[PDB]
Ligand binder design. Structure first.
Ligand SMILES: [Cl-]
Length: 401
């Protein structure tokens, strides 16, 4: 058992209510922000709105701009004991319609005609976050913390992955174990992180199509940082400007974006921690970023089905770039013969199979999609990835099964 996903939000709201929790950047730089106290109150109001609609354990879809209230809606959905279902605002209408329907969304928070031309399921109650009436009703809800006593395995979010997309059900326990495991890893490899409460910032750069965006905001809150974000086209336009002008101290990026932009550590003067993942980094990226004594560079392995990042390791100038490090928190990595449940001798190639608190609940209504299973009566996920363990038990990524 674990503290809930919104635990650190509530904790910093009590101990340091004036710290900034979220900030959204315009202009391109003008910004606006909310304190932990304000973020937490608004999320409780959102949660109370949801509870008044009698929704429990229901899919609540969100298709919003990059706004302060978006963050409060996400947290609110989780405080109300319901499931967050991100739907990227730029998706084609047909694909938005499918996600609403497949997820059985009971309610949706939208703005900006993001749902214009989307077929809504009749069950979907649609709230426009920019509508004077919705704002007035929200401001009228109670602001105290919700009594948060939901089962551990209750879904916290549903994240769709690929021609018919399948929904991955991620539990409260999964997400809260993620925050705990990464709080520990990041605090260890980038100790300045424990000094940055109230000052540092975690750049929320990921598209809402990926679980990474959830990780970014909850890791910011874990450490007392400000989650900072903007319209993605605007943040990506001049990536050095974004890191430099928004005071970013922590970020996650796919490394080819470092290559394309020519980013170096001096373009991000406040940066102390840089997670990369999702593809192998190039030799020059490694040379440039792995030798800094200010920035800790960490390679992260993270299928959606195992909650954002379940293995990671610091990358140094002599590290193999296929190394995905060691399992996080209580996770246990096994390397099994691709066709059986038999462990291979350490050092041999085989399929990576993860066990532990980061393994997701499963796919939503996709009985033929494989990967989740019981192996020796424990819950595991077979990644489809071929790896081998190094002598020191770190894991090298070799390819796809
Ligand atoms: Cl929560």
């Amino acid at each position: 058992s674990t503290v809930p996903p919104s635990h650190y939000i509530e904790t910093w709201a009590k101990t340091h209510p004036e710290w900034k929790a979220v900030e959204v950047a315009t202009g391109f730089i003008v910004t606006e922000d909310w304190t932990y106290k304000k973020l937490n109150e608004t999320a409780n109001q959102v949660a109370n709105l949801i509870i008044h609609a009698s929704l429990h354990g229901r899919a609540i879809a969100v298709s919003l701009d990059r706004s302060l209230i978006a963050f409060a809606i996400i947290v609110g959905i989780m405080k109300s004991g319901n499931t967050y279902v991100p739907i990227e605002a730029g998706l084609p209408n047909d694909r938005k319609s499918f996600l609403l329907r497949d997820s059985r969304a009971a309610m949706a928070f939208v703005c900006d005609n993001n749902f214009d031309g989307v077929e809504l399921p009749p069950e979907t109650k649609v709230l426009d976050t920019k509508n004077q009436s919705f704002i007035e009703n929200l401001s009228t809800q109670d602001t105290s913390d919700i009594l948060n006593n939901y089962p551990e395995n209750l879904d916290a979010y549903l994240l769709y992955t690929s021609g018919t997309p399948k929904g991955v059900r991620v539990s409260r326990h999964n997400l809260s174990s993620f925050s705990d495991a990464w709080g520990k890893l990041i605090g260890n490899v980038a100790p300045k992180s424990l000094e940055l409460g109230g000052v540092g910032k975690f750049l929320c750069l990921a598209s809402r199509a990926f679980d990474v965006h959830i990780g970014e905001m909850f890791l910011a809150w874990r450490f007392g940082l400000c989650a900072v974000t903007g319209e993605r086209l605007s943040m990506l336009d001049d990536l050095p400007r974004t890191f430099r002008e928004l005071g970013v101290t922590h970020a996650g990026i796919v490394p080819s974006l470092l290559d394309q932009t020519g980013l170096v550590p001096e373009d991000a003067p406040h940066l102390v921690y840089l997670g990369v993942g999702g593809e192998k980094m190039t030799p020059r990226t490694q040379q440039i970023w792995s030798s800094s004594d200010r920035v800790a560079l960490v390679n992260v392995y993270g299928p959606t089905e195992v909650t954002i990042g379940c293995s990671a390791g610091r990358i140094l100038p002599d590290s193999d770039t296929r190394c995905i490090g060691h399992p996080l928190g209580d996770s246990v990595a096994h390397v099994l013969a691709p066709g059986s449940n038999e462990h291979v001798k350490k050092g041999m190639a085989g399929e990576l199979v993860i066990e532990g608190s980061l393994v997701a609940n499963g796919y939503l209504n996709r009985p033929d999609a494989k990967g989740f299973c019981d192996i020796n009566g424990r819950k595991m996920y077979r990644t489809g990835d071929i790896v081998r363990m190094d002598a020191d038990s770190s894991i090298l990524f070799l390819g796809r099964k």
